């Protein structure tokens, strides 16, 4: 009944926490995580973690133990998942899209449609960008039979807060089996820069660097209100026959525009150097919805630590088994 999870190996406050919350809500199985971030200088639950826990609590009327800052043990007993309108505030301490990742899978199982609006940080280097959710994950979720639509309403560039991201979701009626493999041909490359409170030549230089390495069929520069920054991100959308993927980098303080763009070029080339449609990050975000569908597969060039973490937690809550068969430097991930 009570699922016991160990945070000692990493992600106790992160991916394990987020996936455990939603799976717990979905299945009705309570869980306890112990040793949350025990080996970190500031150990246990951090502010952003409690926000995620409190959000899940509100959605399903949960009882919780140990939901305090610095706690290395968390116990969560879910109640019934209610649809409806939710507003969460994670502030600069966290990522809007990570709260969304935490709560949305549960809402696929609510009794009615929901809307979730989260205030806090956007454009975080360690979270799915709102546009990634919208343009990469959501078209695939739709294929799986999950219908949700995310819109960023306001930026609050990391490490600030003040951004706003909202998702509309409806309960799943029926799941489908999504099967992905080879990427197929390029249809177009789309380069993008966002700026807030940063000189416009910075975007021009970033686009120029991208163009240096790729033929860009589309190019976009968006200058946002200064108060939403300072901030700068560069993205590249790879639209292929079989999938659309997206890669982004967050501009750093003392890093030249050219270097920032160079980091993104390297990332995209690494993706293109393999045959797989699904990229490194998307892989970890497909595991949960495919496990819930009971079936599905994709290939990925490099199974990440996060992908494996997610697989393990999912298998703890659901009687599914992932196969990961690697040949020729590409791993086929299949929900048995
Ligand atoms: N550049 C990115 N694009 C899309 N998703 C990302 C990116 N970086 C991180 N994520 C996702 O955000 C979550 C947390 O990432 P991490 O903390 O790096 O494990 C995971 O679901 C990642 O796949």
Q: Which atom of ligand 1 lies at the shortest distance from residue 306's CA?
A: 19
Q: Clarify whether residues 288 and 266 are in a common domain.
A: no
Q: Clarify whether residues 97 and 35 are in a common domain.
A: yes
The region that residue 10 occupies, defined by phi over 0 for left and psi between -120 and 50 for alpha, beta otherwise, is left
Cα(14)–Cα(250) distance, integer angstroms: 20
Strand partners, 151: 166
Domain of 234 in residue numbering reads as: 183-273
State the maximum Cα–Cα separation within the chain, in Å, rounded to a whole number: 58
CATH number at 206 reads: 3.30.360.20
Q: Clarify whether residues 153 and 299 are in a common domain.
A: yes
**Which string of DSSP letters, residue by residue, matches 92-151?**
EEEEHHHHHHHHHHHHTTSSS-EEEEEEEEBS-TTS--HHHIIIIIHHHHHHHT-EEEEE
Mutate to test the pocket of ligand 1, among 17, 19, 128 (most ligand atoms within 8 A of CB): 128
Q: Clarify whether residues 304 and 204 are in a common domain.
A: no
Token look-up 């009705």 returns: 28
Pairing mode of beta strands 322-327, 330-335: antiparallel
Q: How buried is 230 (Cβ within 10 angstroms: 0-12 exposed, 13-18 middle, 19+ buried)?
A: middle
The angle, 0 to 180 degrees and rounded to 10, between the axes of the packed helices 96-107 and 15-27 is 20
Q: Which atom of ligand 1 lies at the shortest distance from residue 97's CA?
A: 12
Q: Clarify whether residues 255 and 280 are in a common domain.
A: no
* Neighbour-count burial for 240-277, b at 16+ CB within 10 Å, e otherwise: beebbbbbbbbbeeeeebeebbbbbbebbeebbebebb
CATH number at 162 reads: 3.65.10.20
Pairing mode of beta strands 84-95, 114-121: parallel
Q: Clarify whether residues 42 and 163 are in a common domain.
A: yes
Cα(314)–Cα(328) distance, integer angstroms: 27
Write out the two tokens for 287. Answer: 């595991």
- Domain count of the fold of the chain: 2
Ligand 1: list residues with CB < 6 Å: 14-15, 126-128, 132, 248, 281, 284-285, 306
Strand partners, 219: 191
* Neighbour-count burial for 59-76, b at 16+ CB within 10 Å, e otherwise: bbebebebbeeebbbbbb
Cα(70)–Cα(245) distance, integer angstroms: 37
Q: How buried is 202 (Cβ within 10 angstroms: 0-12 exposed, 13-18 middle, 19+ buried)?
A: buried
How was this model experimentally determined? X-ray
Q: For the chain, what's the residue count? A: 336
């Amino acid at each position: 009944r009570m699922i016991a999870l160990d945070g000692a190996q990493g992600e106790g406050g992160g991916q394990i926490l987020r996936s455990a919350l939603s799976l717990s809500m979905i299945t009705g199985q309570p869980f306890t995580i112990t040793s949350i971030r025990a080996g970190r200088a500031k150990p246990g639950l951090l502010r952003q973690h409690l926000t995620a826990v409190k959000a899940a609590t509100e959605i399903c009327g949960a009882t919780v133990e140990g939901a305090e800052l610095g706690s290395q043990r968390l116990l969560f007993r879910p109640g019934t998942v209610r649809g409806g309108d939710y507003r969460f505030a994670i502030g600069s301490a966290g990522s809007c899209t990570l709260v969304l990742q935490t709560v949305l899978p549960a809402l696929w199982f609510a009794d009615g449609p929901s809307r979730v609006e989260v205030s806090g940080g956007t454009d975080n280097p360690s979270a799915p960008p709102a546009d990634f959710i919208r343009r990469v994950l959501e078209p695939l979720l739709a294929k799986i039979g999950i219908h949700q639509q995310t819109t960023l309403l306001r930026h609050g560039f990391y490490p600030a807060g003040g951004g706003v991201v909202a998702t509309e979701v409806s309960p799943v009626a029926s799941f489908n089996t999504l099967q992905l493999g080879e990427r197929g041909n390029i249809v177009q490359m789309r380069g993008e820069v966002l700026l807030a409170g940063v000189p416009r030549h910075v975007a021009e230089r970033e686009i120029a660097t991208l163009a240096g390495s790729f033929s860009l069929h589309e190019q976009n520069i968006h200058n946002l209100p200064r108060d939403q920054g300072p901030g700068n991100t560069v993205s590249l959308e790879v639209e292929s026959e079989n999938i659309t993927e997206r890669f982004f980098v967050v501009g750093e303080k003392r890093v030249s525009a050219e270097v920032v763009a160079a980091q993104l070029v390297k990332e995209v080339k690494r993706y293109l150097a393999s045959t797989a449609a699904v990229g490194e990050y998307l892989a970890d975000q497909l595991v949960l919805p495919m496990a819930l569908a009971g079936a599905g597969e994709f290939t990925v060039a490099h199974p990440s630590s996060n992908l494996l973490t997610n697989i393990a937690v999912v298998e703890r809550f659901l009687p599914v088994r992932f196969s990961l068969i690697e040949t020729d430097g590409v791993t086929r991930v299949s929900i048995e």
